[PDB]
Amino acid sequence: MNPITLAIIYFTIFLGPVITMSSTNLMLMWVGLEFSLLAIIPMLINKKNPRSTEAATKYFVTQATASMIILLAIVLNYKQLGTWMFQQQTNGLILNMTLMALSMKLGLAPFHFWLPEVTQGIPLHMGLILLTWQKIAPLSILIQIYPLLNSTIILMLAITSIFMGAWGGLNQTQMRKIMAYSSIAHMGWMLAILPYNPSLTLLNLMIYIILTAPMFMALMLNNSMTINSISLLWNKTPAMLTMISLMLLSLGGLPPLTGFLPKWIIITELMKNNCLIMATLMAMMALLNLFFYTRLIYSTSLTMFPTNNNSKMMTHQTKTKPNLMFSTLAIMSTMTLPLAPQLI
């Protein structure tokens, strides 16, 4: 990429979420969403492999129709209130549209089909951006409008996502898609507490970002899109085997690690609000997510899969190092739990 183009695109992919967050005029929030859609598509097809064009063409159509639905909600509001922004008075259907639409861009629940497929055809790098710096934008729009959205729908999309994410993940063996599925799940918890305590959504996101960003830079350190590929981690780079183990169990909710806090406080907030029906079912299938996380643990760490002689060759050569971010985001993530009170 002519480095100039790289700058323009990257600026847009970054001006995209930032305009959304900063503005209050919904319109300006919509174009922030629009710029993110335009900026991400070029990077998605960088290899320009036949799989890639498929990825972008799906991502784009799914993103575009949702963008149009979000605009329709703003256009309708404009006629039910002269304001260009959702208010207490807003017709309920107007808000529900925004939930569905925004739940498509974020890819939650019954609209979770595009994400796993686009996460499969894009590079590991652009995978991260597509999973974590593109969720900030839509979520911002929701978090702003939380007082007004429906508790019922969110919960249904929340629970569905948790289930779909978990069930989908169990079968998958491609890593990119295992992560895509996890993101659907975590995204679910996040949207469950939005109606009740938005501030916790912003924790269940950061922690997801501080967990997923190290996890993916791990997958690419050896650029392994297969579990079999990550399983030979012990030969290619032995040290990351320890933290890859804890980060994945952290992604699932197991108690000593940082990953428990988001689930724990979301459950505490939902029980405070009396959803002890919903919270219970979510926590239970949340346990299904750890099963596929630990199955990967087995292959990568607890058991040593057989490797190839040609690997001895890759050991010889100095391994290009993992950026510092890996460490700082691996530790702050695997073990901050002793510092939970200040996080929330």
Partner 1 sequence: MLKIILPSLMLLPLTWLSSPKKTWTNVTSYSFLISLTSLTLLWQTDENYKNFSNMFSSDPLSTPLIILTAWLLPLMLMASQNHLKKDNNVLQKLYISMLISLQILLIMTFSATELIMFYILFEATLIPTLIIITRWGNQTERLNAGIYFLFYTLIGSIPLLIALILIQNHVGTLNLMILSFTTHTLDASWSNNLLWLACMMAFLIKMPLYGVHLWLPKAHVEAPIAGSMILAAILLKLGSYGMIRISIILDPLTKYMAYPFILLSLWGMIMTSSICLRQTDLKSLIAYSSVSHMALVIASIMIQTPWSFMGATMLMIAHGLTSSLLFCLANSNYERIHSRTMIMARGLQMVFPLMATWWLMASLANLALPPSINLMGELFITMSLFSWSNFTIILMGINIIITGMYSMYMIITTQRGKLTNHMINLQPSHTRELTLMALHMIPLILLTTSPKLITGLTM
Partner 2 sequence: MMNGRPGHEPLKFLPDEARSLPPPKLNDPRLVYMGLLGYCTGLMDNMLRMRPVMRAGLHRQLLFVTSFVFAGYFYLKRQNYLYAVKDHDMFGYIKLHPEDFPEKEKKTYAEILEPFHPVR
Partner 3 sequence: RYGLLAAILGDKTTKKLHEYSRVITVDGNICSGKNKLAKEIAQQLGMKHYPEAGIQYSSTTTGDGRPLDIEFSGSCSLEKFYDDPKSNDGNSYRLQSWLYASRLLQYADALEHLLSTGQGVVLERSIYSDFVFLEAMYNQGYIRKQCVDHYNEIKRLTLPEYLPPHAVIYIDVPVPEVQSRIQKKGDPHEMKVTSAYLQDIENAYKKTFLPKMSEMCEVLVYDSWEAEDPTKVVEDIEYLKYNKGPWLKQDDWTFHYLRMLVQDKTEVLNYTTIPVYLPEITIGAHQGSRIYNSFRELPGRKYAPGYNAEVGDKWIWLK
Ligand X SMILES: CCCCCCCCCCCCCCCCCC(=O)OC[C@H](COP(=O)([O-])OCC(O)COP(=O)([O-])OC[C@@H](COC(=O)CCCCCCCCCCCCCCCCC)OC(=O)CCCCCCCCCCCCCCCCC)OC(=O)CCCCCCCCCCCCCCCCC
Residue numbers at the binding site for partner 2 (CB under 8 A):
197-199, 237, 239-240, 243, 319, 321-322, 324, 326-328, 330-332, 335-336, 338-339, 341-343
- Sign of the Cα torsion 77, 78, 80, 86 reads positive
The strand pairing partners of 226, in sequence order, are: 174
Rounded to 10 deg, the angle between the 175-192 and 198-221 helix axes is: 170
Torsion of CA 328, 330, 331, 335, to 10 degrees: 150
Minimum CB separation from partner 2 for residue 339, in Å? 6
**Can you give the binding site for ligand X, defined by CB under 6 A?**
234, 238-239, 241-242, 245-246, 256, 301, 335
Minimum CB separation from ligand X for residue 334, in Å? 6
Minimum CB separation from ligand X for residue 231, in Å? 12
Question: Closer to partner 3 at the Cβ: 88 or 309?
Answer: 309
* Distance between CA atoms of residues 315 and 282, nearest Å: 43
* Contacts with partner 3, 195-234, as mask; x by CB under 8 A: ---------------------------xx--x-xx-xx-x
Secondary structure of residue 127 in the 3-state scheme: helix
Residue nearest to ligand 3PE (CB): 280
Minimum CB separation from partner 2 for residue 88, in Å? 14
Are 229 and 219 in contact, with CB atoms under 8 Å apart?
no
Residue 225 interface partner, choices ligand X, partner 2, partner 1, none, CB cut-off 5-8 Å depending on type: none
Nearest to 99 by CA among 137, 150, 64: 150
* Distance between CA atoms of residues 94 and 195, nearest Å: 16
Minimum CB separation from ligand 3PE for residue 275, in Å? 10
* Distance between CA atoms of residues 292 and 310, nearest Å: 29
CA distances from 32 to 36, 44, 75, 141 (A): 6, 19, 16, 10
Binds partner 3 (CB under 8 A): choice among 48, 82, 93, 306: 306
Q: Is residue 72 near ligand 3PE by the rule CB under 6 A?
A: no
Are 163 and 281 in contact, with CB atoms under 8 Å apart?
no
Query: Which DSSP string do the residues of 28-39 spell out, in sequence order?
Result: HHHHHHHHHHHH
Kindly identify the residues of this chain, within the stretch 273-292, that bind ligand 3PE according to CB under 6 A.
276-277, 280-281
Kindly identify the residues of this chain, within the stretch 237-276, that bind partner 3 according to CB under 8 A.
238
Minimum CB separation from partner 3 for residue 147, in Å? 45
* Rg (alpha carbons) of the chain, rounded to whole number: 20
Are 185 and 165 in contact, with CB atoms under 8 Å apart?
yes
Kindly identify the residues of this chain, within the stretch 268-287, that bind partner 1 according to CB under 8 A.
268, 271-272, 276, 279-280, 283-284, 286-287
Residue 2 interface partner, choices partner 1, partner 2, partner 3, none, CB cut-off 5-8 Å depending on type: partner 3
Q: Is residue 65 near ligand 3PE by the rule CB under 6 A?
A: no
Secondary structure of residue 226 in the 3-state scheme: strand
Look at the block and give the residue holding tokens 């939930």: 99
Binds partner 3 (CB under 8 A): choice among 48, 50, 82, 320: 320
Q: Is residue 303 near partner 1 by the rule CB under 8 A?
A: yes
Q: Write phi, then psi, for 174 (nearest 5 degrees).
A: -80, 135
Q: Is residue 291 near partner 1 by the rule CB under 8 A?
A: yes
Instruction: Give the residues lining the site for partner 3 (CB under 8 A).
Output: 1-3, 6, 222-223, 226, 228-229, 231-232, 234-236, 238, 304-321
Instruction: Give the residues lining the site for ligand 3PE (CB under 6 A).
Output: 276-277, 280-281
